[PDB]
Design an enzyme around this catalytic site. Structure first.
Site, PDB file in Angstrom:
ATOM      1  N   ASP A 148       0.812  -1.212   0.000  1.00  0.00           N
ATOM      2  CA  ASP A 148       0.000   0.000   0.000  1.00  0.00           C
ATOM      3  C   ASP A 148       0.848   1.266   0.000  1.00  0.00           C
ATOM      4  OD1 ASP A 148      -2.369  -1.450   0.019  1.00  0.00           O
ATOM      5  OD2 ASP A 148      -2.440  -1.514   2.205  1.00  0.00           O
ATOM      6  N   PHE A 153      -4.726  12.597  -2.358  1.00  0.00           N
ATOM      7  CA  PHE A 153      -3.307  12.679  -2.677  1.00  0.00           C
ATOM      8  C   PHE A 153      -2.848  14.114  -2.905  1.00  0.00           C
ATOM      9  CE2 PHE A 153      -4.387   8.412  -4.621  1.00  0.00           C
ATOM     10  CZ  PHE A 153      -3.992   7.714  -3.508  1.00  0.00           C
ATOM     11  N   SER A 173       2.172   6.905   0.564  1.00  0.00           N
ATOM     12  CA  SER A 173       1.407   6.072   1.476  1.00  0.00           C
ATOM     13  C   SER A 173      -0.054   6.240   1.106  1.00  0.00           C
ATOM     14  CB  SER A 173       1.641   6.464   2.933  1.00  0.00           C
ATOM     15  OG  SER A 173       0.992   5.559   3.806  1.00  0.00           O
ATOM     16  N   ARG A 174      -0.725   5.143   0.770  1.00  0.00           N
ATOM     17  CA  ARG A 174      -2.094   5.278   0.303  1.00  0.00           C
ATOM     18  C   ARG A 174      -3.111   5.300   1.434  1.00  0.00           C
ATOM     19  NH1 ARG A 174      -5.278   2.241  -4.737  1.00  0.00           N
ATOM     20  NH2 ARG A 174      -6.584   4.082  -5.141  1.00  0.00           N
ATOM     21  N   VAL A 175      -2.701   5.655   2.648  1.00  0.00           N
ATOM     22  CA  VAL A 175      -3.664   5.995   3.689  1.00  0.00           C
ATOM     23  C   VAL A 175      -3.684   7.502   3.930  1.00  0.00           C
ATOM     24  CG1 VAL A 175      -3.810   3.764   4.779  1.00  0.00           C
ATOM     25  CG2 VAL A 175      -1.912   5.225   5.318  1.00  0.00           C
TER      26      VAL A 175
END
Ligand code: ATP
Ligand code: ADP
Lengths: 51, 481, 502, 72, 125, 245
Positions: C339, F192, C364-366
């Protein structure tokens, strides 16, 4: 003198870019050489195992 | 160990197949001597090692010697133990092959103690967790690329730079400074170079020929004339001879290996002979395990410590090839030997900037040592960058901080030299041992402005900065006179 | 194919003696053809695939290949003293390890057997090694931070509890300083750490374990250690026993952490094992099942939903690259599995920037779901200013717009670089991290000296920890950067600046 | 030619003779060497001997290695 | 190729006259062997050729010889696969030829036909 | 893949509905087929894939069609291993797809999101009879300037921009403007970046690139084009940049 200074700076930048490109190209060359060797021996061994 | 007698069933190159009684056959990694017959009219035995159990009362071995002149049905003697080599002070100043036989023609060695070359490493509890600094007494190595006790060091210098003189100085210094001994293991040793090395070791006083067993080294030679089984296991033979000196005698042992690339090369050869499928770039599939089972017995227990100094060859000059890449997973430090420094006479020819070490950290060597070593590195790097400008402008058309930098750098670069105990025999200078404390106290003085009014040829080829000031006073007396 | 392994003479003689009868060899198998990480066994008619078998020497095995006449088991050690013709016994149990709460503080050798020298471990045997991963309904979105103690990680690459964050870099570039930093930072939190050493030299495992014991982290840490001299089967299987040990605590509502040091070494062991079993290899001689090897191991790191006790397991796998080769096979496999990654870089590590995070290529995909309110509010400006520095230092040697850029790069970027660097084995609490990011990225640390930044920051850290207990209370109470903490920190850093000017 | 010996095995020869030629050369030069004389031997294209040995090793169904060359 | 070579052998030996032997791609004489070699049960060599490449090429190339009773001047075309001069089939012919005439693709791509590489095509005369 | 395809095919056939079939990583279908085919006792193909790779791909991809009853618009992710586009699995997927979109590691690491490579990403619907002539001509000119840029990239890598001619440096500047304007903020990537996603219609994209290529917007920063949509917003961002200074 200012033209020669500008040429000195341009050639310093060109030497440094050619240095970084030499590093990158040596990296890609070593990768391709190992991949070539791997494929060659795996193909020979595959033929010898089929035989 | 008994009447477990085998009979040869196959002979395909240096790989044999032996057949046995139905209940009694050796384990893997077990020696077996082939009671063979020379065509000339005498018997001669061949030692092999079991590699694999094949099924109906049949194993597959790999010969340590040649298999020419062997018939099917020769009596193969199981031995119940791995390859057993002689160990102890009886193996000092002598040359051995992979089987522990002497090949220096001085006579026989008494097998009063024989250890197996196949052995598990020390336990996780028996390991020493301390980060000690091996002191070689050489200024450049101790200051800029420190050694670890129980770690491995890679020699990267090409042919012709001061490599053999360096390892002879390391042997003599671990014998005279500490109570240690050394064990040279020649993996793939060219025979004429082996003879030259043995002669120079006799001459440099390392191998006391007037009285053996006073010597400081044991030589094990696995030569290129030998089959790939011997050339692979000679490193294990050398490591066993070193591990006896660690375990029983509690010394600080120094295990010299020749090109650890030829260890990997012999391993890939025996795997190709045994028929296993190759790994990535054609190496053996058991590459990392074959390397680790060797390198994990070079440690420091509670008793002594083996420090290995392994020459490393990089095929095709890349560090990402599997043999350099798997060797570098065990190296704690690195010394590169400079053709240019060997040319301009800065013996020992160690490159100060390209030699690395993981021991050079504040927590391990003291903030003082770390900061002075970093300042020396910065000074030499600035001089290396400034050589072209000094070639164009000159030292006068520079600035003052740059000029003092250049002068201090010339003095430092000449201070990284040393007269060697073993290189004295043709150079004449009496040879010096310089501990790390005098090294850092001398470099503090040569770096802060306490010793700047001295000639550059006063620091060259001395140890112990007091000798630099003394030779400076003599070089000034040369002027006063 | 005209030859088999069961065609040895004793088996055929016992077949010829009595052809038709009733009772076969139920649990008695005789080993034949002990090979290279495999041993073929005639017998074991009722053995299971995945069953543990036991040899006369004491070596454990696993029934993998169950052919018609012989089963081929894989040796879980050096099969050296396996006498040919000796008996083998099944155990009736699929591959398991005893799990307990008493593993904390012990060192393991991938078989749940201690190499610690401190006696056996009491346990209640459960927890199959190849446990199934949680489903889709079982888990939950990540929402709480796992504080690593590093300013760069916690500020720009936030890791949450239940997230697979990769640590990819070259050799001697960090990743173990980072892994042990994250483990040592778990002192106050209720986190059961697990360290798996798959192919490390035994001296490095010794260094890590003595650092853990010295700093006090072994009261919640298990160490599963496979050294470089171990069989490829044990290096292959060590992270699965690590994951099973951590899952025992995970499914009992406790938050765990696990670090698989050198999963590239596990892939190398799997390559050795497949090549010795003659399986057809793909690119770089890898078996092709190497993606599955890594994915079924990493898919166990989850964040279980409220019905399943709200446990968690964070995974910090470590992958080495060859000269920074992100586009290799195993690095891209682990990148496609996890992730987000944390790129360490050899140029910045060797050049002195010591936690060498290559921030522009790590994700970081959180993100904000992982970070608390305080760190979000403070570190937004930090990642912006560092972004600007990232193109300035590369493209502009001196600058374009040389006056404002000197007010841009010298004030923000080159001092934030010294602000982010952090010594070996020295974690920071989240209050000190919020405070240090605030003092840097707001504009207050824009007129210091480039070697005095570190000393100023450490002294300000101890000062605020000593003379401002209410800032730590109001950050540990709400985890949000209120105006009161902001103002008192402003006057406190003025106090500390006038103290340190002298 | 008065102090030279030429061992010639051309490329129509079987692989065994091209494999054996440098060894007969070395045996003759070894005779002269052990009788206290100085010799000099030139192996023209040792790689051709390596190819002959590879051919016979592959024809004997031996396991190949890199570039199909045998392990020895 | 052996048939045509036999026809030239007769004209050189029994009739004792200068024969001119033109051969088209002798890469095909080796490629046919590499095609049948797997079915002949032989194990494969380097990059995919038969293990007997050098001996098979050498027999035919050594039968071509001026024999002091008559001569055979033989002009041979050697297909180099993928412009790879280090391929085994041309590499084993380079040893059997007197004057090699290497053709470049970089000159054909300009129109320097005959695209004979001047710095690569050497000769022993 | 087969069971998802069967569920979609039932809606296509019987319900006669226009179905969407979003498949994530049809490469892993090939990879698992290779994994079982090694154990199934088969000699492997070139890179260790299964010998039945092309047919295993075609027996799945030829059932995803538009019959007279319905239509299955399937959008499939195709992983390439080790960034090797010549690999057997993507190289056999290319023959079945009729609108590709190739993503670049370089464009991704340059922050240009989405990382679509403009010159390798092709389609069979870029024809003047299908998308009109204005769209076709603008796509042609965009690809031509990007191709000229990719050509002179190595010369401007070693030497730099200072050695190009006037028209070549204008081409460089317009290609940098184009490759910045090709990026866009997404709705699903609002975690993002922030600065929420913009839906940019077709005509707005055509007009924006007409303005870039026409010569009007040659006097404004490139960073006004980065991470915007509907080039009115690039003009507004250039105004904001030169106002906030
Ligand atoms: N943040 C840090 N501050 C100071 N020193 C560090 C830091 N990180 C690493 N080091 C030092 O660098 C050396 C290598 O670091 P580390 O152990 O983290 O890498 P590694 O995992 O050993 O690399 P590999 O095992 O792949 O060779 C260690 O000896 C450590 O002392
Ligand atoms: N410390 C030294 N002082 C003087 N001469 C040296 C020193 N070290 C090496 N040399 C000279 O440099 C040469 C290096 O050769 P050597 O290192 O033995 O080659 P190799 O590395 O191939 O064994 C030697 O001939 C030696 O005379």
């Amino acid at each position: 003198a200012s033209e020669l200074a500008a040429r000195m700076t341009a050639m310093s930048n060109a030497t440094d870019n050619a240095n970084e490109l030499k590093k990158t190209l040596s990296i890609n060359y070593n990768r391709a050489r190992q991949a070539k060797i791997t494929g060659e021996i795996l193909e020979i061994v595959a033929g010898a195992n089929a035989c | 160990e008994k009447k477990n007698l085998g009979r040869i069933a196959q002979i395909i190159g240096p790989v044999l197949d032996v057949a046995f009684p139905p209940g009694k056959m050796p384990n893997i990694y077990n020696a077996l001597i082939v009671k063979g017959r020379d065509t000339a009219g005498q018997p001669m035995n061949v030692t092999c090692e079991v590699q694999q159990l094949l099924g109906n009362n049949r194993v597959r071995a790999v010969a340590m010697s040649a298999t020419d002149g062997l018939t099917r049905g020769m009596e193969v003697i199981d031995t119940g133990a791995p390859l057993s080599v002689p160990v102890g002070g009886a193996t000092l100043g002598r040359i051995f092959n992979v089987l522990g036989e002497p090949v220096d023609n001085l006579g026989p060695v008494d097998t009063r103690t024989t250890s197996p070359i196949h052995r598990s490493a020390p336990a996780f509890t028996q390991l020493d967790t301390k980060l000690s600094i091996f002191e070689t007494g050489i200024k450049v190595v101790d200051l800029l690329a420190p050694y670890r006790r129980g770690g491995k060091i890679g020699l990267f210098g090409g042919a012709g730079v001061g490599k053999t003189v360096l390892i002879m100085e390391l042997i003599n210094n671990i014998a005279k400074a500490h109570g240690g001994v050394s064990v040279f293991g020649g993996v793939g040793e060219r025979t004429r170079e082996g003879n030259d090395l043995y002669m120079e070791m006799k001459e440099s006083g390392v191998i006391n020929e007037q009285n053996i067993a006073e010597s400081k080294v044991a030589l094990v030679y696995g030569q290129m004339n030998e089959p790939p089984g011997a050339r692979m296991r000679v490193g294990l033979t050398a490591l066993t001879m070193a591990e006896y000196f660690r375990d029983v005698n509690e010394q600080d042992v120094l295990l010299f290996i020749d090109n650890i690339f030829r260890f990997v090369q012999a391993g890939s050869e025996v795997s190709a002979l045994l028929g296993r499928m190759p790994s990535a770039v054609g190496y053996q599939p058991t590459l990392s395990t074959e390397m680790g089972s060797l390198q994990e017995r070079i440690t420091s227990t509670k008793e002594g410590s083996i420090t290995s100094i392994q020459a490393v060859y990089v095929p095709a000059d890349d560090l990402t090839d599997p043999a350099p890449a798997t060797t570098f997973a065990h190296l704690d430090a690195t010394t590169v030997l400079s053709r240019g420094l060997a040319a301009k006479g800065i013996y020992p020819a160690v490159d100060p900037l390209d030699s690395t070490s993981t021991m050079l950290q504040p927590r391990i060597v003291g903030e003082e040592h770390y900061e002075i070593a970093q300042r020396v590195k910065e000074t030499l790097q600035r001089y290396k960058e400034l050589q072209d400008i000094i070639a164009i402008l000159g030292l006068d058309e520079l600035s003052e901080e740059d000029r003092l930098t250049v002068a201090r750098a010339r003095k430092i670069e000449r201070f990284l030299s040393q007269p060697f105990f073993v290189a004295e025999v043709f150079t004449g200078s009496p040879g010096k041992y310089v501990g790390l404390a005098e090294t850092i106290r001398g470099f503090q003085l040569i770096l802060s402005g306490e010793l700047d009014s001295l000639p550059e040829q006063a620091f060259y080829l001395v140890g112990n900065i007091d000798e630099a000031t003394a030779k400076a006073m003599n070089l000034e007396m040369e002027s006063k006179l | 194919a005209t030859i088999r392994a069961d065609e040895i003479s004793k088996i055929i003689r016992e077949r010829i003696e009595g052809y038709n009868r009733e009772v076969k060899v139920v649990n008695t198998g005789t080993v034949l053809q002990v090979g290279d990480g495999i041993a073929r066994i005639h017998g074991l008619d009722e053995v299971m695939a995945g069953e543990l078998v036991e040899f006369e020497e004491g070596t454990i095995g696993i029934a993998l290949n169950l052919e018609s006449n012989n089963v081929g088991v894989v040796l879980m050690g050096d099969g050296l003293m396996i006498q040919e013709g000796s008996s083998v016994k099944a155990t009736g149990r699929i591959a398991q390890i005893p799990v307990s709460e008493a593993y904390l503080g012990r060192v393991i050798n991938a078989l749940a057997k201690p190499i610690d020298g401190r006696g056996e471990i009491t346990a209640s045997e459960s927890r199959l090694i190849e446990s199934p991963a949680p489903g889709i309904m079982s888990r939950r979105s990540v929402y709480e931070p796992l504080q690593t103690g590093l300013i760069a990680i916690d500020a720009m690459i936030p890791v949450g509890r239940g997230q697979r964050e990769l640590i990819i870099g070259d050799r001697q570039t960090g990743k173990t300083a980072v892994a042990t930093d994250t483990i040592l930072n778990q002192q106050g939190q209720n986190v059961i750490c697990v360290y798996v050493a798959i192919g490390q030299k035994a001296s490095s495992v010794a260094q890590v374990v003595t650092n853990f014991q010295e700093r006090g982290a072994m009261e919640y840490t298990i160490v599963v250690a496979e050294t470089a001299d171990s069989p490829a089967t044990l290096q292959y299987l060590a992270p699965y026993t690590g994951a099973a040990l951590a899952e025992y605590f995970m499914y009992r509502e406790r938050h765990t952490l696990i670090i698989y040091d050198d999963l590239s070494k596990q892939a190398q062991a799997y390559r050795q094992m497949s090549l010795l079993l003659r399986r057809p290899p793909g690119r770089e001689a890898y078996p092709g099942d190497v993606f599955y090897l890594h994915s079924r191991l990493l898919e166990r790191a989850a964040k279980l939903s409220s019905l399943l006790g709200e446990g968690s397991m964070t995974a910090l796998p470590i992958v080495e690259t060859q000269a920074g080769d992100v586009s290799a096979y195993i690095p891209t496999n682990v990148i496609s599995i996890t992730d987000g990654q944390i790129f360490l870089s050899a140029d910045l590590f060797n050049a002195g920037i010591r936690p060498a995070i290559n921030v522009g290529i790590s994700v970081s995909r959180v993100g904000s779901a992982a970070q608390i309110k305080a760190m979000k509010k403070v570190a937004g400006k930090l990642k912006l200013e560092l972004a600007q520095f990232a193109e300035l230092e590369a493209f502009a040697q001196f600058a374009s717009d040389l006056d404002k850029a000197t007010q841009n790069q010298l004030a923000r970027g080159q001092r934030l670089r010294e602000l982010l660097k952090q010594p070996q084995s020295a974690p920071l609490t989240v209050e000190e991290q919020v405070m240090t990011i605030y003092t840097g990225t707001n504009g207050y640390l824009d007129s210091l000296e480039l070697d005095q930044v570190r000393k100023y920051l450490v002294e300000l850290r101890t000062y605020v920890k000593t003379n401002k207990p209410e800032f730590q209370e109001i950050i540990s109470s709400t985890k949000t950067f209120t105006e009161e903490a902001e103002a008192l920190l402003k006057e406190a850093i003025q106090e500390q600046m006038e103290r340190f000017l002298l």
